[PDB]
Amino acid sequence: MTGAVCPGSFDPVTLGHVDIFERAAAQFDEVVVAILVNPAKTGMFDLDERIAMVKESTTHLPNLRVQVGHGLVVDFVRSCGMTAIVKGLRTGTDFEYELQMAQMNKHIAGVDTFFVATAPRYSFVSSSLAKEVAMLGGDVSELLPEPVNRRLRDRLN
Amino acid sequence: MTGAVCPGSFDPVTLGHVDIFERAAAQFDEVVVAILVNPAKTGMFDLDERIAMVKESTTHLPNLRVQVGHGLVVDFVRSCGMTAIVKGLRTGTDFEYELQMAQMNKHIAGVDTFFVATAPRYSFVSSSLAKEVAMLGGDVSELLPEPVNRRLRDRLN
Amino acid sequence: MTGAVCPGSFDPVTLGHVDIFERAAAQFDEVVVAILVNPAKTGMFDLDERIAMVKESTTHLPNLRVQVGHGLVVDFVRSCGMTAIVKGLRTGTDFEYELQMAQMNKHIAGVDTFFVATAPRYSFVSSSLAKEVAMLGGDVSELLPEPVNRRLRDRLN
Amino acid sequence: MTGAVCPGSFDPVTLGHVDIFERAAAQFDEVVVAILVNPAKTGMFDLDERIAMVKESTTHLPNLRVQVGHGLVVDFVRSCGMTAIVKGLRTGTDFEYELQMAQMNKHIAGVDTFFVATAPRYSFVSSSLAKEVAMLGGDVSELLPEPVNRRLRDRLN
Amino acid sequence: MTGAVCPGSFDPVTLGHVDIFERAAAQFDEVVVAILVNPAKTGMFDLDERIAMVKESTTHLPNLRVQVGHGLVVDFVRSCGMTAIVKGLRTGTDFEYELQMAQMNKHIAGVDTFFVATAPRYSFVSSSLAKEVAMLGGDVSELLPEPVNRRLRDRLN
Amino acid sequence: MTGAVCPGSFDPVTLGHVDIFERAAAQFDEVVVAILVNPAKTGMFDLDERIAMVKESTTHLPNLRVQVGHGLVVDFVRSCGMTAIVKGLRTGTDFEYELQMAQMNKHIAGVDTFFVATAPRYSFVSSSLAKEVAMLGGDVSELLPEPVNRRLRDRLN
């Protein structure tokens, strides 16, 4: 009867995220990656692209599924019939804020949040920094799954 | 001859703020809650509303008064004839930044800043997160004074 | 096929620990509380006492069991046929060190470590501080399970 | 009816401590410096010396007095008829631990703890580091009051 | 064969920055201050002004030169024939983010980043806070070089 | 005219230390690894062993030399005719304390301290944790140079 949700904007998903997905998948019967929507623009890839990149990057995880999140994460979590959120912590993570949200979430919906440190090698990657560097000409291909690099290379060019 | 100022945007005031007001009120002869103004919009409640919510939430503190702050906090503080600022520290607080401002304030006006940890139970509440959650349908009534919940419920609906 | 280990010296177990036990128990099929041994003395309660206090404080958690840990936590974890460690994070937690150990543990045994924030109300309790305060005459009964208070009161007197 | 206690081992008192004493003295009607005792040795100066150094370094603060602390700080505080503790925060301060103690102290005795950042120039001085450096031949005279340097020079030699 | 780059927006340069420039200049044969450009506006001083203020504030550092940075800092660094970046760390510094960028930069270009703590006295100054305070009427002249105060006074008025 | 000192107990030296040595060696004309002495015991390897392990692990760094440190690091630094200390920062590093020492060192001897983040892969290794794990049977060979593993294996057995 176990399951966990991994929420995020995944714009785009990185190998740090995938590492977290793999570890959650190894510890819970079912994992749902919840891709949060963007009110307008300001994001790099649209929802369909984000979903595709995540699905394409998680074919080796049979007990994991991708779905679009709407509203409060806790509402999505309880709609999935779960009470756990799994989030990775890495270099640049505003972990103080993650703590605030975790307790707020416990308070309003009884939902637990389990944190896990990302692998050392993916500790400095973030969707935001990967995009910034990629935009300015830097090669971040070793920090992103190939389905993402493929699309990232195409966006540019 | 003692007094302290508790500055903030209080949009809206939370029970974490009230806890700080109560503790400052117990240690200083006079406490002044300074509500900072907003250059345009982007805030949820207007100044009059913010003032009302604070006053209505502090009727049990006779040595406390609410006033609108303008310009540098230190200028307001010295205008009140005081040299102390009391700020609460809680989960999500950018305490590194609070330290920078405290020393900058000491440097330019000789004004001291005393920090106090918020009660554990109100440690994850912030005006910003309360609004975000409230906006998306979450019930944060147990973290805000009733004068605020009353108005928050009315804003929605 | 899920299980997690909650390692510690639990000298004595606090309500913060119990909160963590409850949350791990709600998310994993099986939870094992691993009480680490002490090379000589310097601890307040002996192993038998620690075990008893934990068992007596966890009767409401059927899928949880208490066992004595020996050697590396990861060796104990794999001996239990698991690959997950669940640890609570609270005020005073040397979380930077917990991160170091988590990654070291992942590196040497492939064991994952999931962290969870303790409830706000139990955020300032630690076995060490509870003992220090208790020793000097302070009443920490509201932060410890009754099976522990009973024994703590008896130790003194 | 206001007063605050500044607890510590003050072995020896530094200019960072004096800065805190001065600021507490400017904001509270009465300030009491509570010098905590040492169970045996391991300290550099004995109680009488510590008291003397503090008194000699605070002659310019008429509303401040030095007394020897025994037991829990909160018990000392309430014995002084106060409910406030003032502590300075500086480089090397285990502020996470100070937060734990502040809340524990609030919990057991209703005593408030107000923190203040030390002046930038005294931010890296601590009794411990001053002694370590002094022991190995370093000159830390600019970070300690003269009554302390006088005694420190005499200890050596 | 040694050299280091000190990148930043320097809008405007502060005495904290100058302290870092001086220390880098004392340890490396050649130092290049790289002033990053601003995509549109939102900055206070234009590029020419920023360059002038830095040059005027560094006449005592013969082995230092000012140049305008474009694109990734690492690309600028390697274009200067160097592999080191020197950045100061101070109160308000998002050092967690600096760590992320340092490792990202090492990863993509093999460029090292050396951090140095700013002098205690300039630990609370930042271009942003200096401007904010200056804008509201505060005197921050003791935290900025005279070439900057001259221009800052003229901007206002 | 450039040089830097890398001080430490190196008991034993790890690959994280070597990474720092390599980076310092690439940026300074001369690097001196200063092995600090131990007042009595409590250390695992004796001075001669520590020196040997460091020398054997740094044969690829021609501009680096190993020497035994005595007294204050700053005194050793100035005796080497240098004014720079290079230290690595990693997971578990008490960086708040490193900041205190850096400023104390600047204050008493004018010596600068440059910090560098360790490579992500060696971010969780420390001499202390490597020994603790090694002692209890864990294999930390991938985090230590072979000259150290050779000796570590021999110590045990």
Short mmCIF file of C-alpha atoms in Angstrom, two decimals, chain E residues 63-117:
data_model
loop_
_atom_site.label_atom_id
_atom_site.label_comp_id
_atom_site.label_asym_id
_atom_site.label_seq_id
_atom_site.Cartn_x
_atom_site.Cartn_y
_atom_site.Cartn_z
CA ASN E 63 49.00 44.35 -11.86
CA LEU E 64 45.22 44.74 -12.12
CA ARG E 65 43.18 45.64 -15.18
CA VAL E 66 39.48 46.22 -15.87
CA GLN E 67 37.69 44.69 -18.84
CA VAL E 68 34.08 44.12 -19.87
CA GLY E 69 32.85 40.56 -19.58
CA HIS E 70 30.61 38.94 -22.18
CA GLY E 71 28.95 35.51 -22.01
CA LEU E 72 30.01 32.75 -19.62
CA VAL E 73 32.60 33.80 -17.05
CA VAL E 74 34.63 30.66 -17.80
CA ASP E 75 34.84 31.64 -21.48
CA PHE E 76 36.13 35.07 -20.44
CA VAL E 77 38.57 33.45 -18.04
CA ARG E 78 40.03 31.10 -20.65
CA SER E 79 40.15 33.99 -23.14
CA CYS E 80 42.38 35.77 -20.61
CA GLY E 81 44.52 32.64 -20.60
CA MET E 82 43.66 31.90 -16.96
CA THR E 83 41.88 29.13 -15.05
CA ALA E 84 41.08 30.84 -11.75
CA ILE E 85 38.21 32.95 -10.48
CA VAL E 86 38.48 34.79 -7.17
CA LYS E 87 35.25 35.77 -5.38
CA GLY E 88 34.72 37.31 -1.96
CA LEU E 89 32.26 35.85 0.54
CA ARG E 90 30.36 38.17 2.89
CA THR E 91 27.17 38.62 4.97
CA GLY E 92 24.28 38.09 2.58
CA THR E 93 26.33 36.05 0.13
CA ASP E 94 24.30 33.15 -1.24
CA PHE E 95 27.38 30.95 -0.73
CA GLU E 96 25.34 27.83 -1.44
CA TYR E 97 24.72 29.19 -4.91
CA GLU E 98 28.37 30.22 -5.30
CA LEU E 99 29.26 26.59 -4.62
CA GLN E 100 26.87 25.40 -7.31
CA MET E 101 28.34 27.82 -9.89
CA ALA E 102 31.93 26.98 -8.91
CA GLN E 103 31.40 23.29 -9.53
CA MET E 104 29.38 23.89 -12.70
CA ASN E 105 32.24 26.09 -13.91
CA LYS E 106 34.85 23.47 -13.03
CA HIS E 107 32.76 20.87 -14.85
CA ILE E 108 32.31 22.78 -18.11
CA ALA E 109 35.66 24.55 -18.43
CA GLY E 110 38.10 23.19 -15.85
CA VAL E 111 38.13 26.62 -14.20
CA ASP E 112 38.91 26.82 -10.47
CA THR E 113 37.18 29.23 -8.11
CA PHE E 114 38.93 30.48 -4.96
CA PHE E 115 36.81 32.14 -2.28
CA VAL E 116 38.04 34.61 0.33
CA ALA E 117 36.16 36.09 3.28
#
